[PDB]
Amino acid sequence: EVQLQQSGPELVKPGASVKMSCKASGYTFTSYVMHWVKQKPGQGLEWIGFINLYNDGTKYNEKFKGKATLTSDKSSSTAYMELSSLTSKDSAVYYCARDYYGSRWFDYWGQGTTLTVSSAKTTAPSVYPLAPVSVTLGCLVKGYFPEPVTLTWNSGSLSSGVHTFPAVLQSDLYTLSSSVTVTSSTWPSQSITCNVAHPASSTKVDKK
Amino acid sequence: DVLMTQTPLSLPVSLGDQASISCRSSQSIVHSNGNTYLEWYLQKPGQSPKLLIYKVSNRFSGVPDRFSGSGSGTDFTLKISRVEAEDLGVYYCFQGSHVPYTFGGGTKLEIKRADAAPTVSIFPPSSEQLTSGGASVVCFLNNFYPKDINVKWKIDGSEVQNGVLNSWTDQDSKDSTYSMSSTLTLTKDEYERHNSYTCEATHKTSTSPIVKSFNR
RNA sequence: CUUGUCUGACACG
DNA sequence: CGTGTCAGACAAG
């Protein structure tokens, strides 16, 4: 029942700092040392460092000294991490994993905070229906910053026969599509509605 | 600074079979304790990693006996017996022995399945986007295998490898299939200047390319 | 559960 | 040299 909850997404501009959170529940937050890891999207993992939550003594990866700063609020059971002088090379996913023994390897991991380092501004998405020329429909989310978007069909239903393709980046803009395959008995009679909810700018809903 | 190489970069296995993912290290990971702090981590698609083995062979709470770890010194092996479909994802070996803790390159375990042919679906631009001076032609290629497919785009009879976005989703836990999405983002002026649009898919599952087209 | 320990980390003196 | 906190392991009573 040891859970680890991190802060939500973050778009910061090249040159600035940012602090991340890691709430721990279900165990003595001060007992087990906290660990942080970095994984650029589509790449491998990389250990950052660990902080002794009882004394707040920190140990970093020498390549991360000057970038990361491990602190915490032992009373609120929340662990923090600070990244100064952000560059595009730092735009990745940062996890916080608890230590299993001797502050050497990890056992439990958080869901992961997604950091985005870019000067681009927040642009709301544009949803477009995908009508045919069983049948297959679609939903096109085009032109948005920053990630993330939530695309669901029928308020969460119709989870089967649906493929949500990862978003692609082009000219500081995102584009996400999702196809849905349903029985032929449905589209002319029963309607499939797309639900796009970009927490940074808007939330749109449109039928086919 | 010790590096971790994983011999199997990709490993296609059929359900029931066992897989051997090896992870040789750059230096000796044997700490003065006599203990080797070599781990194995699993990161299923769309999820954060989970610990599997934590000494060289010690199984963490949750893993069955199928997963066993062997090898000491600089050569290490992970054995996944009785492979399942919920075992998709990349496997990392992690050493908590020396100064900087370092992972390996990863290993993408692929579930070996029967050959499947894509279900190519094409969609003309939306009337809403057309009013917005935009016209995106989306192409869908779903439920196929292996992942070796090639998508082409033609405009009025001419290969257009220009302004094309391809999106690949992970291997389905249930279907064990892949699905691709290509889209050709043009302008309204550029779109209405042509009549016939196509996206083609060349796959092992078809001696001839799967062609879809329309003319508005 | 109790006793005798082994071990890694951090803080401190 | 030592001291404290923290955990994960142990053998034996």
Residue numbers in the entry:
A (entry chain H): 1 to 133, 141 to 215
B (entry chain L): 1 to 216
Which text from the study accompanies this structure?
S9.6 asymmetrically recognizes a compact epitope of two consecutive RNA nucleotides via their 2′-hydroxyl groups and six consecutive DNA nucleotides via their backbone phosphate and deoxyribose groups. The co-crystal structure of the S9.6 Fab-hybrid complex reveals that S9.6 binding buries solvent-accessible surface areas of 450 Å2 with the RNA strand and 382 Å2 with the DNA strand, mostly through interactions with the VH domain. By contrast, the VL makes few direct contacts to the hybrid and primarily acts to constrain and help present the complementarity-determining regions (CDRs) of the VH. The co-crystal structure reveals that the S9.6 binding interface on the hybrid spans only the central 6-bp duplex out of the 13-bp used for crystallization, consistent with a previous report that the minimal epitope required for S9.6 recognition is a 6-bp hybrid. The 6-bp hybrid duplex is asymmetrically recognized, with three consecutive RNA nucleotides and six successive DNA nucleotides seen in direct contact with S9.6. The ten-residue loop of CDR-H3 extends into the minor groove of the hybrid, which positions a stretch of four consecutive residues—Y101, G102, S103, and R104—to recognize three successive 2′-hydroxyls of the riboses of rU7, rG8, and rA9 (RNA strand numbering preceded by an “r”). In summary, the co-crystal structure reveals that S9.6 recognizes an extended segment of six nucleotides of the DNA strand, principally through Y32 recognition of two backbone phosphate oxygens and Y54 recognition of deoxyribose via a sugar–π interaction. The S9.6-bound hybrid adopts an overall A-form helical geometry, as do free hybrids and dsRNA. For comparison, the S9.6-bound hybrid is bent by 18° compared to a model dsRNA.
The DNA-RNA hybrid–specific S9.6 monoclonal antibody is widely used to map R-loops. We demonstrate that S9.6 exhibits robust selectivity in binding hybrids over double-stranded (ds) RNA and in categorically rejecting dsDNA. To understand the specificity of S9.6 for hybrids over dsRNA and dsDNA, we solved crystal structures of the free S9.6 Fab at 2.3 Å and its complex with a 13-bp hybrid at 3.1 Å resolution. In both structures, the heavy and light chains of the Fab stabilize each other through extensive hydrophobic interactions primarily between aromatic side chains (Tyr, Phe, Trp, etc.), burying a total solvent-accessible surface area of 1783 Å2.
